[PDB]
Each structure stands twice: as C-alpha cells, then as structure tokens.
Amino acid sequence: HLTMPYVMPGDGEVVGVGEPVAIRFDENIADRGAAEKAIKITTNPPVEGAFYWLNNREVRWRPEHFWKPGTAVDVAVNTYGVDLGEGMFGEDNVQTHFTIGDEVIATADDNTKILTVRVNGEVVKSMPTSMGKDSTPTANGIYIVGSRYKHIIMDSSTYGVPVNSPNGYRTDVDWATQISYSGVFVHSAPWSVGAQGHTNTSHGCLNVSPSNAQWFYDHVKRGDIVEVVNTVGGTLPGIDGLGDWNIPWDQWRAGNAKA
Ligand SMILES: *SCc1ccccc1
C-alpha cells in the first residue's frame, strides 16, 4: 500500500503572494503528523509557516501573512519509505522550488461595485463589476487565484446540482479566472456591461467586461489574491480549496494534525 505525494505549485513556477504550498496524496493519510514531519520547507527570505489540512488527502503550508515578493521557496517532501499510518508508505520523494512574484491584490468592493487591481500597492486597473445577486450572493473574504480558461462551460451538474433545479446553471464563458473551488470565477460578461458598476446580477461570479476579463486572464497569475468586501453574502470557507487565508493564523498555526 503506497501513496504518492504531489506538490503544488510546480517546480520552477512563479506564483502570487497568496499561494500556499500544497502536498496532496492519492490516498487518505492515517497519520497526519507523520506526513507533516516528513515535509521540510525552506524559505528565503526566511519566514515562519505552518501546516493545515484541507481534508484527509491534502495539507497546505503557508505563512501568517502573504508572501514577500521575490521569496524563494524549496519544498522537500521526504516521504519515500515513510510510514504514513495503517501500513501505508510513501511511494517517492518530491522536491520543488518556486518563487513569489509581484504582489497582485484585486479587491471587489460591493459598495462601489468596482474590482480594483493593485500591483505592489499601485492601481493598474479599475474594473466595474457585477457580482452575485442578493439570492445568490458572492461571499466576502480572501480568494486565491487558481486556474484560468480561455473558454469554459460551467455546468452545475459537475457539482451534483441539476441544471434545472434551484441552485442549477449552465453557461459558457470566455476569459475565466478561477478563484474558488466552489466555482467562483472572474470572467467576461458582455451581457452585463450595463449592470457592471451598478447592480449585482450574477450567480456568484465576478462579471467584468470582455477587455477586463481578458486582461485578468493575461496578467493575474496562480496565487495572486482577490478580496471580496461588503457583499450581503457570507464568508468563503477556509477549506474551499482556495480559501486558506480566511482561517485566522492562530487557528491555522495550531493545525489539525490530530483531527
Ligand atoms: S459563479 C456560479 C456559482 C454558483 C454557486 C456558487 C459560486 C458560484
């Protein structure tokens, strides 16, 4: 019984200031503490960080605050032959190096209905946006940018939710940047340009103009941050998959290796 670790982000990547280290196993880990002790993270400049498990197969490590731009990170997952509990052994090691890019923080403020992109503190874009309508609102919180798609079909049935049901949907969109595993995206919405900056019309996604969505796709990278503030929604879950920063540091740091 072997289990293979997979580390994100990829070796040689540049990622945003929000990117956690992720170590994800292809089997449930019975002894989380054993996995944690086998994983060594080196930072330059050196920063404290801590492990927190999103579920039984994936642990994350990050610092208290967003990474400092230019930080170099080395991840040594020394799991080959290590007993991860219930007679499961690590199949191999993984060794990954990556670097933190520029500080890119985009804030969507429902009081202004503008998505402002700041690069190292400077506004580079101000994008009118239309967010989730009151019945399906966009959650407030900190979102980590994930994958991007030039065109993607978003079908609720991907999440076990029938399309012709209350929480259902089926649409195709261009220039989509993923910001939660729950299915929140920044994307092109030419049909809501009138409403962008004025009225929330979406199902939760951040609708922007075709040009702004393409800009986002081209220039915002994995690990950059989107913050949503002042909506009528709740808070993005800490264990979403891209919601890691919504867990306060004191809780994160304490971890969940015994849970
Ligand atoms: S963008 C569609 C969507 C539905 C539910 C939750 C989040 C996003």
Side-chain angles (χ1 to χ4, degrees), residues 79-137:
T79 41
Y80 171 78
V82 174
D83 186 346
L84 300 167
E86 282 182 15
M88 196 182 293
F89 293 87
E91 192 166 327
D92 201 347
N93 300 324
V94 305
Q95 175 76 239
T96 296
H97 176 99
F98 67 93
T99 84
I100 304 313
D102 284 298
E103 178 198 55
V104 182
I105 303 165
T107 299
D109 180 353
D110 200 26
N111 160 265
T112 64
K113 289 178 176 57
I114 300 293
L115 175 64
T116 299
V117 184
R118 289 184 175 273
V119 175
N120 297 319
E122 182 176 326
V123 178
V124 295
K125 294 281 168 168
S126 307
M127 308 179 169
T129 187
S130 176
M131 298 198 279
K133 69 188 173 292
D134 289 357
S135 59
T136 60

Side-chain angles (χ1 to χ4, degrees), residues 7-253:
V7 50
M8 283 283 96
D11 190 38
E13 279 260 289
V14 182
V15 294
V17 299
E19 187 77 334
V21 182
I23 306 92
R24 191 188 230 255
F25 299 87
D26 65 351
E27 304 283 346
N28 297 354
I29 299 294
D31 192 326
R32 291 180 172 185
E36 291 181 14
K37 288 159 187 296
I39 303 164
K40 292 308 192 312
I41 294 157
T42 303
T43 48
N44 188 25
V47 66
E48 175 192 13
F51 296 105
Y52 198 94
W53 292 75
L54 297 193
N55 56 59
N56 287 324
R57 300 192 193 194
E58 180 168 354
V59 66
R60 293 291 176 88
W61 187 109
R62 59 175 176 81
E64 177 175 4
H65 297 309
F66 297 153
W67 288 106
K68 176 183 165 50
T71 301
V73 182
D74 294 281
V75 185
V77 180
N78 302 325
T79 41
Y80 171 78
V82 174
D83 186 346
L84 300 167
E86 282 182 15
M88 196 182 293
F89 293 87
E91 192 166 327
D92 201 347
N93 300 324
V94 305
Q95 175 76 239
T96 296
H97 176 99
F98 67 93
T99 84
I100 304 313
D102 284 298
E103 178 198 55
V104 182
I105 303 165
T107 299
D109 180 353
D110 200 26
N111 160 265
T112 64
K113 289 178 176 57
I114 300 293
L115 175 64
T116 299
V117 184
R118 289 184 175 273
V119 175
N120 297 319
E122 182 176 326
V123 178
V124 295
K125 294 281 168 168
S126 307
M127 308 179 169
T129 187
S130 176
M131 298 198 279
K133 69 188 173 292
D134 289 357
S135 59
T136 60
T138 303
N140 294 303
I142 300 172
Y143 295 67
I144 303 153
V145 171
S147 288
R148 58 177 193 161
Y149 312 84
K150 57 211 200 310
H151 180 83
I152 188 179
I153 280 144
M154 333 227 260
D155 189 302
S156 67
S157 65
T158 292
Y159 301 91
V161 175
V163 170
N164 289 344
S165 76
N167 289 335
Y169 54 77
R170 198 253 265 247
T171 310
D172 65 298
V173 298
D174 295 326
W175 308 118
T177 297
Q178 174 197 44
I179 64 165
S180 77
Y181 284 20
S182 64
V184 180
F185 293 76
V186 176
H187 69 79
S188 177
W191 55 87
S192 69
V193 169
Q196 287 155 28
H198 302 285
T199 289
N200 287 337
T201 59
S202 85
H203 206 103
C205 291
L206 287 53
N207 286 16
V208 295
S209 73
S211 55
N212 283 328
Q214 185 176 8
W215 191 97
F216 212 92
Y217 176 97
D218 290 334
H219 286 161
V220 181
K221 64 173 75 69
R222 192 172 306 269
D224 293 345
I225 289 288
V226 172
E227 307 200 10
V228 177
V229 300
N230 293 319
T231 75
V232 305
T235 304
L236 185 67
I239 63 173
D240 165 90
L242 295 160
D244 310 36
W245 300 103
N246 302 291
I247 295 174
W249 174 243
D250 293 323
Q251 176 179 2
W252 185 281
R253 185 181 195 280

